[PDB]
């Protein structure tokens, strides 16, 4: 079905841990993709070959316009390939470092495409867990695609930075649907602020901001946008919003844009 042979390597896109993303295109047909190439040495000592299984479970399946495509995968004697869809705008995360901050306008656009794949995912019982700026690639028309489901499971179950993680999944407690909530809600605080509500110099000490729930707005930060930010940083998940009350909420109706 799919060996290296049929494709046309170009360009690193992403560089990491278990291996590179690099821009490719498919000999025959002219296609023009994203291949992510991991080392089978690197993913067996972090054991994390059940995760891999689910991203290509997870994302082959799914089909909504906010969520990256995998079209398949393949792999030879040390390396897995992921064929993904390839975001020609790159990452939110690169964005951001470019922008330093976004508009009200731009956040509650990207609140809304985040809710709504967020959405058709929990309508799926599919649970991201691991939503950050890294793993948001933008379309060719600047739509947010969520990319990286391999921290996802079905919920409700039971690392690097903590930063987007709730209390209740850094205390390794029960957690649902209600984690990608919490996240959302940090990423609307990083889109406006630059910088995540819990961020720190050390691990420890973000762990302490993300338990006691420690966050202070900058003075730029609106009514609106404050209201909605601190509904979702609630410690209780039962607290947080649902995705509906999200995309109606005020800020974001009066803010956001449609197709
Ligand atoms: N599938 C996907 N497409 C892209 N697009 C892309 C386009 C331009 C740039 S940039 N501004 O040049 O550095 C970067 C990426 N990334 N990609 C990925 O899976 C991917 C990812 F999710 C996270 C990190 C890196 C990736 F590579």
């Given at each position: 079905?799919?060996?290296?042979?049929?494709?046309?390597?170009?360009?690193?896109?992403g560089?990491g841990?278990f291996?590179?993303?690099?821009?490719?295109?498919?000999?025959?047909?002219?296609?023009?993709?994203?291949?992510?190439?991991?080392?089978?040495?690197?993913?067996?000592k972090?054991?994390?070959?059940?995760?891999?299984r689910?991203?290509?479970?997870?994302?082959?399946?799914?089909?909504?316009?906010?969520?990256?495509?995998?079209?398949?995968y393949?792999?030879?004697?040390?390396?897995?390939?992921?064929i993904?869809?390839?975001?020609?705008?790159?990452?939110?995360?690169?964005?951001?470092?470019?922008?330093?901050?976004?508009?009200?306008?731009?956040?509650?656009?990207?609140?809304?495409?985040?809710?709504?794949?967020?959405?058709?995912?929990?309508?799926?019982?599919?649970?991201?867990?691991?939503?950050?700026?890294?793993n948001?690639?933008?379309?060719?028309?600047?739509?947010?695609?969520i990319?990286?489901?391999?921290?996802?499971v079905?919920?409700?179950?039971?690392c690097?930075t903590?930063d987007?993680?709730?209390?209740?999944?850094?205390?390794?407690?029960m957690?649902?649907?209600?984690?990608?909530?919490?996240?959302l809600?940090?990423?609307?605080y990083?889109?406006?602020?630059?910088k995540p509500?819990?961020?720190?110099?050390?691990?420890?000490?973000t762990y302490?901001?993300?338990?006691?729930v420690?966050?202070?707005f900058?003075?730029?930060?609106?009514?609106?946008?404050?209201?909605?930010?601190?509904?979702?940083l609630?410690?209780?998940?039962?607290q947080?919003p649902?995705?509906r009350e999200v995309l109606?909420?005020?800020?974001?109706?009066?803010?956001?844009?449609?197709?």
């Open positions: 079905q799919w060996a290296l042979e049929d494709f046309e390597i170009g360009r690193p896109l560089k841990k291996g590179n993303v690099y821009l490719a295109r498919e000999k025959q047909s002219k296609f023009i993709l994203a291949l992510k190439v991991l080392f089978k040495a690197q993913l067996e972090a054991g994390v070959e059940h995760q891999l689910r991203e290509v479970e997870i994302q082959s399946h799914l089909r909504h316009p906010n969520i990256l495509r995998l079209y398949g393949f792999h030879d004697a040390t390396r897995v390939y992921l993904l869809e390839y975001a020609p705008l790159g990452t939110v995360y690169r964005e951001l470092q470019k922008l330093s901050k976004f508009d009200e306008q731009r956040t509650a656009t990207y609140i809304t495409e985040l809710a709504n794949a967020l959405s058709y995912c929990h309508s799926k019982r599919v649970i991201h867990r691991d939503i950050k700026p890294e948001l690639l933008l379309g060719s028309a600047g739509e947010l695609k990319a990286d489901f391999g921290w996802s079905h919920a409700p179950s039971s690097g903590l987007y993680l709730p209390p209740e999944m850094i205390e390794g407690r957690h649902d649907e209600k984690v990608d909530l919490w996240s809600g940090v990423l609307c990083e889109f406006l602020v630059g509500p819990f961020e720190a110099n050390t691990y420890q000490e302490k901001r993300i338990s006691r420690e966050f202070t900058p003075d730029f930060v609106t009514e609106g946008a404050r209201d909605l930010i601190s509904r979702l609630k410690h209780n998940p039962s947080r649902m995705l109606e909420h005020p800020w974001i109706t009066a803010n956001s844009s449609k197709p």
